[PDB]
Amino acid sequence: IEKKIVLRNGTEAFDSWEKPPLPVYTQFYFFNVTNPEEILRGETPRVEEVGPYTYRELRNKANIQFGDNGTTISAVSNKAYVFERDQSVGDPKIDLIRTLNIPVLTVIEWSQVHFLREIIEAMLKAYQQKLFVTHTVDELLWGYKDEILSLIHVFRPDISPYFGLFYEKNGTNDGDYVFLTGEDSYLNFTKIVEWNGKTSLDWWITDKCNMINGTDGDSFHPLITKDEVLYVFPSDFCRSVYITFSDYESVQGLPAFRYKVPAEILANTSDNAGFCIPEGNCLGSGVLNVSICKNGAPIIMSFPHFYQADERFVSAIEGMHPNQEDHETFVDINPLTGIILKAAKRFQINIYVKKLDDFVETGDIRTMVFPVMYLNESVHIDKETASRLKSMI
Ligand SMILES: *[C@@H]1O[C@H](CO)[C@@H](O[C@@H]2O[C@H](CO)[C@@H](O[C@@H]3O[C@H](CO)[C@@H](O)[C@H](O[C@H]4O[C@H](CO)[C@@H](O)[C@H](O)[C@@H]4O[C@@H]4O[C@H](CO)[C@@H](O)[C@H](O)[C@H]4NC(C)=O)[C@@H]3O)[C@H](O)[C@H]2NC(C)=O)[C@H](O)[C@H]1NC(C)=O
Ligand SMILES: *[C@@H]1O[C@H](CO)[C@@H](O[C@@H]2O[C@H](CO)[C@@H](O[C@@H]3O[C@H](CO)[C@@H](O)[C@H](O[C@H]4O[C@H](CO)[C@@H](O)[C@H](O)[C@@H]4O)[C@@H]3O)[C@H](O)[C@H]2NC(C)=O)[C@H](O)[C@H]1NC(C)=O
Numbered sequence: 332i333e334k335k336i337v338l339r340n341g342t343e344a345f346d347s348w349e350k351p352p353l354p355v356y357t358q359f360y361f362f363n364v365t366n367p368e369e370i371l372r373g374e375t376p377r378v379e380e381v382g383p384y385t386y387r388e389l390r391n392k393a394n395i396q397f398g399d400n401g402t403t404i405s406a407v408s409n410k411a412y413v414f415e416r417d418q419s420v421g422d423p424k425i426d427l428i429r430t431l432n433i434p435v436l437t438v439i440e441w442s443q444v445h446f447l448r449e450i451i452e453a454m455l456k457a458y459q460q461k462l463f464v465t466h467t468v469d470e471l472l473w474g475y476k477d478e479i480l481s482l483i484h485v486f487r488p489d490i491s492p493y494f495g496l497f498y499e500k501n502g503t504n505d506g507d508y509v510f511l512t513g514e515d516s517y518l519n520f521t522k523i524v525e526w527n528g529k530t531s532l533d534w535w536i537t538d539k540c541n542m543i544n545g546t547d548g549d550s551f552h553p554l555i556t557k558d559e560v561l562y563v564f565p566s567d568f569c570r571s572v573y574i575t576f577s578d579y580e581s582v583q584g585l586p587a588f589r590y591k592v593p594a595e596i597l598a599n600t601s602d603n604a605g606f607c608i609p610e611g612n613c614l615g616s617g618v619l620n621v622s623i624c625k626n627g628a629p630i631i632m633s634f635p636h637f638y639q640a641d642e643r644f645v646s647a648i649e650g651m652h653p654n655q656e657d658h659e660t661f662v663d664i665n666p667l668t669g670i671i672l673k674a675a676k677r678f679q680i681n682i683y684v685k686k687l688d689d690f691v692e693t694g695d696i697r698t699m700v701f702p703v704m705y706l707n708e709s710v711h712i713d714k715e716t717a718s719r720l721k722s723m724i
């Protein structure tokens with residue numbers, strides 16, 4: 332039967348859930364701020380966009396121990412990145428990107444205390460710290476030592492000196508999971524239950540919001556059918572998300588189910604309500620306040636070029652051009668096995684920024700959600716393993 336797919340030792344199904352066959356590609360795109368001065372003086376930001384910077388991923392999920400008479404399994408998804416100079420636009424070490432200096436933006440919200448605002452302000456004046464800063468693509472991505480964080484270490488050592496969009500994340504995991512193997516049913520295959528032992532999320536408001544649904548996102552149960560809707564829990568995005576059925580496609584050799592990410596997921600609605608930390612005050616349709624799970628930094632997740640978000644957002648930054656073709660997030664699954672064939676995962680990263688009279692560095696700047704960069708986590712199935720799947724099916 333089609334019940335050949337479960338996590339059990341040695342089986343072809345489980346086999347590659349350990350080391351997957353697929354050359355997954357992550358591509359970074361940065362927003363270069365071309366009129367930083369005027370941004371401060373109060374104009375509308377003008378950005379240019381540089382990318383792709385393409386890394387190839389190495390995925391191995393280790394630290395495995397089974398349990399509960401064979402119905403559960405625990406591991407960590409481990410992930411690393413290899414830079415390809417040919418398939419990227421330029422060299423991440425050579426090329427420069429001018430953009431927000433987040434450590435200062437962060438230590439500014441990190442100060443909720445009046446004497447802290449006072450003192451932490453003194454720092455920026457004396458150290459000659461500006462709001463907009465120029466770094467190398469490699470630096471922003473991976474790490475650079477900031478003059479400001481360097482100090483905070485000498486005081487409050489728990490805080491790391493370095494900063495990078497991904498810092499200390501090359502070769503590490505997104506945390507320790509436990510997946511329900513497909514024994515108890517074919518439906519609960521590679522579904523998630525306990526993440527760091529947390530059987531629900533702590534930091535949203537409503538229980539619905541806090542809940543953990545669906546797979547890790549690299550796979551689904553067999554018999555995916557046109558009507559039914561799929562749940563996914565990407566870690567870096569901080570919430571449980573779901574996809575809907577679009578249409579029938581053929582990718583490489585196989586039949587496929589096109590699944591996009593529907594609008595009702597990121598909008599202002601009674602269902603999505605509990606994701607607004609200000610007790611029911613929402614930022615708008617199409618963005619997320621991730622500032623809780625990002626350590627308290629002013630971070631806003633969104634879709635590339637604000638796609639699916641209230642036009643009032645696309646309006647705030649000139650140089651934004653969302654189109655469904657480039658900026659959506661689809662996935663193409665095999666309706667029988669629940670295997671992912673053609674998939675492109677695209678989300679953005681923004682810093683919430685507004686004027687502050689206490690801090691001279693923020694100047695007259697507009698109150699807005701300000702984009703730093705976005706990425707495409709893609710994948711494509713080659714010819715060699717297309718036949719092998721056509722075989723097994
Ligand atoms: C990861 O995510 C990013 C997106 O965020 C992807 O990068 C994008 O890739 C797109 C294509 O995959 C690029 O889009 C192209 O942009 C060109 C101009 O910049 C434009 O000329 C292209 O338009 C053609 O393709 C369309 C189909 O997409 C057609 O409808 C259109 O008419 C053009 O197609 C040709 O048309 C002529 C007639 O005019 C025909 O004679 C040709 O035969 C047609 N050829 C084809 C193939 O149709 C297209 O819009 C986009 O620029 C790029 N953006 C960035 C920022 O990188 C990544 O690819 C994605 N995944 C991976 C794995 O990289
Ligand atoms: C993102 O935007 C930023 C800001 O606009 C941009 O940074 C700038 O990059 C240029 C090069 O592309 C840097 O210009 C250099 O500056 C040094 C002095 O600081 C000069 O010595 C250099 O002179 C050369 O210029 C010509 C070649 O470019 C030659 O004719 C000449 O003989 C020299 O070889 C050069 O002008 C500039 O310093 C930065 N600006 C800042 C503030 O860092 C960045 O390049 C953009 N990124 C992308 C990917 O487009």
Ligand SMILES: *[C@@H]1O[C@H](CO)[C@@H](O[C@@H]2O[C@H](CO)[C@@H](O[C@@H]3O[C@H](CO)[C@@H](O)[C@H](O)[C@@H]3O)[C@H](O)[C@H]2NC(C)=O)[C@H](O)[C@H]1NC(C)=O
Pocket residue numbers: 443608609614620622623627683
């Ligand atoms: C995104 O979410 C963050 C939380 O992660 C929001 O920050 C929170 O803002 C509220 C104000 O609505 C703060 O509440 C008040 O703080 C003061 C000072 O401590 C206190 O005396 C009041 O009683 C009240 O609790 C709250 O402190 C703050 N939370 C954190 C963790 O900083 C933020 O406003 C959201 N961003 C946007 C753009 O909406």
Ligand SMILES: *[C@@H]1O[C@H](CO)[C@@H](O[C@@H]2O[C@H](CO)[C@@H](O)[C@H](O)[C@H]2NC(C)=O)[C@H](O)[C@H]1NC(C)=O
Pocket residue numbers: 411412413414473501502
């Ligand atoms: C992330 O770490 C990996 C693994 O350490 C790096 O990839 C490899 O390791 C060294 C790096 O100097 C070199 O042998 C090659 O670059 C890689 N070899 C193999 C076999 O993969 C990778 O460079 C790191 N990525 C970043 C952006 O730092």
Ligand SMILES: *[C@@H]1O[C@H](CO)[C@@H](O[C@@H]2O[C@H](CO)[C@@H](O)[C@H](O)[C@H]2NC(C)=O)[C@H](O)[C@H]1NC(C)=O
Pocket residue numbers: 539540541542543544571572573602
């Ligand atoms: C997590 O999963 C549950 C069930 O899949 C989602 O709650 C369902 O929501 C729909 C529409 O909101 C209702 O028609 C169902 O009755 C609900 N079922 C249950 C069991 O609650 C919940 O929305 C999901 N949460 C997130 C954050 O995705």
Ligand SMILES: *[C@@H]1O[C@H](CO)[C@@H](O)[C@H](O)[C@H]1NC(C)=O
Pocket residue numbers: 515516518519
């Ligand atoms: C697994 O799916 C079946 C199908 O409805 C359900 O009976 C069972 O409760 C699911 N597992 C858990 C832990 O709920």
Ligand SMILES: *[C@@H]1O[C@H](CO)[C@@H](O)[C@H](O)[C@H]1NC(C)=O
Pocket residue numbers: 599600601612613614615
């Ligand atoms: C979101 O919608 C609710 C009513 O559905 C409204 O009370 C709230 O103020 C809205 N928030 C925004 C940011 O539009």
